[PDB]
Amino acid sequence: VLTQPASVSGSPGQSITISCTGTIYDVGKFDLVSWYQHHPGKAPKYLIYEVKKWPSGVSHRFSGSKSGNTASLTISGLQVEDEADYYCCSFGGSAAVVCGGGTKVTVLGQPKGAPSVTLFPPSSEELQANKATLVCLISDFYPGAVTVAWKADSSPVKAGVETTTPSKQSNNKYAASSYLSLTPEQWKSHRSYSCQVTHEGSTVEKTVAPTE
């Protein structure tokens, strides 16, 4: 693997550079470094090849260079649409290619938001099937980093919790969800259950109780 910074950030209009560090056997050996831009949901796109050359149709806001065992992709006129994962690949010696871990580009200045949290108790039907799931749905938060804790009555609960990583919504804020699995007896034998969602600036907690 070639080593790339996990994350690079910039403001719109600004220039950012993404590094790609190899060894004497690969990056430093030849002028055979390429870069690819990946928007998840689409196949990666050819951006740069042979260190600094452009494939047809690619914007010249992206430029590539190399010094020693380190290749660099520079993005000028930074736009929000440049948010993507960027990967470098190189000739790796012994007729092989080696690629990098990727770099996530974040464009700064985007609208922040607190999470909206909706908590559903187990349905009557699920209980009647001798199962119970609490459903905690979390949306509209930015930046996309949240921690979700559950409580039974006023005490932390870790067993039976399943929580997703945040994923981007259509409006570029994030959504996540968390599920607490209980037996119907556990659901009914407690005062309350709570889903508490901590974001950078606030904690939002929703509670449900079997006595409705």
Residue 2 CB, nearest approach to other proteins (Å): 9
- Mention every residue, 6+ apart, whose C-beta is less than 8 A from residue 146: 115, 138, 166, 174, 176, 197, 198, 199
Is residue 29 close enough to count as binding Na ion by CB under 5 A? yes
Contact with Na ion (CB under 5 A): which of 3, 19, 30, 44? 30
Q: Find the distance separating the first CA and the last CA of the chain, reported in whole Å.
A: 54
With contacts defined by CB under 8 A, name the span among 105-113, 116-124, 150-158, 187-195 that binds other proteins. Answer: 116-124
Smallest distance, other proteins to C-beta of residue 125, A? 6
| Region for 60 from its dihedrals, namely left if φ exceeds 0, alpha if ψ lies in -120 to 50, beta otherwise | alpha
The tokens for 74 are: 């520079």
Of 2, 12, 201, which Cα lies nearest the Cα of 106?
Answer: 12
What minimum distance in Å lies between the beta carbon of 137 and other proteins? Answer: 6
Which amino acid, one-letter code, is at 18?
I
Site pattern 17..56 for other proteins (x: CB under 8 A)? ---------------xxx-x-x----xxxx--xx----x-
For residue 32, the minimal CB distance to Na ion (Å) is 5
| Among the listed residues 164, 183, 192, 202, the single contact to other proteins using CB under 8 A | 164
Residue 38 contact among Na ion, other proteins, none, beta carbon within 5 to 8 Å by kind: other proteins
CA distance 6 to 23: 19
In whole angstroms, how close is the CB of 109 to other proteins at the nearest point?
25
Question: Residues near 37 by Cβ (< 8 Å), separated by ≥ 6?
Answer: 44, 45, 47, 62, 84, 85, 86
Q: Are 145 and 164 in contact (CB under 8 A)?
A: no
Q: How far is the CB of 67 from other proteins (least distance, A)?
A: 19
| Calpha distance 197→111 (Å, rounded) | 19
* Residue closer to other proteins, measured from CB, 53 or 191: 53
Structure tokens at 21: 């560090």
- Binding residue for Na ion (CB under 5 A) from 5, 101, 184, 210? 210
Residue 91 binds Na ion (CB under 5 A): yes
Q: Candidates 105-113, 143-151, 170-178, 186-194 — which segment interacts with other proteins by CB under 8 A?
A: 170-178
Which residue lies nearer to Na ion by CB, 59 or 123? 123
